[PDB]
Amino acid sequence: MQIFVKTLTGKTITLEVEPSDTIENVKAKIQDKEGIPPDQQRLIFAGKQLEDGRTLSDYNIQKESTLHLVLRLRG
């Protein structure tokens, strides 16, 4: 399935996922695309900050959903 991750600039990236993938899985594919480490990612959906352990379907995230990405960048 396809989902969307949207950043605070409005930039929106398309991800290829299954409803069974964990959030860290989702975070991993993001890292591989834009070179951003998982610990520095925060994914929000429907007001909740998504936890790394839970499944995409656990948050009832379906085809063509949009996630929000906020970055806790470190140095």
Partner 1 sequence: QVLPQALYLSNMRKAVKIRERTPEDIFKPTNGIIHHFKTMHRYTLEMFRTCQFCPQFREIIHKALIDRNIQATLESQKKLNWCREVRKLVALKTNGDGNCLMHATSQYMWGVQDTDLVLRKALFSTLKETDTRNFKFRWQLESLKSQEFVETGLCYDTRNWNDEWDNLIKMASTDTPLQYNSLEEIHIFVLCNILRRPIIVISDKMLRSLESGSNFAPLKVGGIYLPLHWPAQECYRYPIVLGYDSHHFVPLVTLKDSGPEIRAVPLVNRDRGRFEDLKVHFLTDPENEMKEKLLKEYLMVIEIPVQGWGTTHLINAAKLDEANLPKEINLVDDYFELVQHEYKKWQE
Q: Which one of residues 13, 15, 17, 28 is an interface residue with partner 1 (CB under 8 A)?
A: 13
Nearer to partner 1, 11 or 20 (CB): 11
Pairing type for strands 12-16 and 48-49 reads unpaired
Q: In this structure, what are the phi and psi dihedrals at residue 14, rounded to the nearest 5 degrees?
A: -100, 130
CA dist 42 → 20, 25, 70 (Å): 19, 13, 5
Question: Under DSSP, is residue 42 helix (H, G, I), strand (E, B) or coil?
Answer: strand
Q: Which one of residues 2, 4, 20, 49 is an interface residue with partner 1 (CB under 8 A)?
A: 49
Shortest Å distance, C-beta 25 to partner 1: 20
Binding site for partner 1 (CB under 8 A): 7-9, 11, 13, 33-35, 42, 44, 46-49, 68-75
